Write a protein that binds this ligand. Structure first.
Ligand SMILES: N=C(N)N[C@@H](C(=O)NCC(=O)N1CCC(c2cc(-c3cccc(Cl)c3Cl)n[nH]2)CC1)C1CCCCC1
Length: 121
């Protein structure tokens, strides 16, 4: 049961890392223009329920990946995982920081998130 969550988290981590690795391969008029896109960062992200704050920024993530290229299926998969992991009991009320982030900073935040949860179970 916890292993099921652990494996789901492992796929999530890997999916985010794939996107991040796919970002370094780009040119220079692509990378610079891509980094101007601003993402919302969660004020608090320490437990599984906070993955709502990932779901709520998948649309801009998919948007930015489409303008940089399938991205539809990778983000689709992240959604499926996130929906499973976030729990279906109550909707978590997401709070975001005043300082926005690049796509790199955004990914690095959620990569650090997954690794932190995996460590605690
Ligand atoms: N849904 C959001 N995360 N909201 C942000 C949002 O609406 N994003 C917009 C944004 O960051 N833009 C608008 C589109 C701009 C753009 C960049 C590109 C582009 C063009 C060629 C290649 C590539 Cl990869 C890209 Cl990303 N096309 N258009 C970049 C900056 C706002 C957050 C709060 C402050 C204001 C932004």
């Amino acid at each position: 049961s916890t292993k099921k969550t652990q494996l789901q988290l492992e796929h999530l981590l890997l999916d985010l890392q794939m996107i991040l690795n796919g970002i370094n391969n780009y040119k220079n008029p692509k990378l610079t223009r891509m980094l101007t896109f601003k993402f919302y960062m969660p004020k608090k992200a320490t437990e599984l329920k906070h993955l709502q704050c990932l779901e709520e920024e998948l649309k801009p993530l998919e948007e930015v990946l489409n303008l940089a290229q399938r991205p539809r299926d990778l983000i689709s998969n992240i959604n499926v995982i996130v929906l499973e992991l976030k729990g279906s009991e109550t909707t978590f009320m997401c709070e975001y920081a005043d300082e926005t982030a690049t796509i790199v900073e955004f990914l690095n935040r959620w990569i650090t998130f997954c690794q932190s949860i995996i460590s605690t179970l």
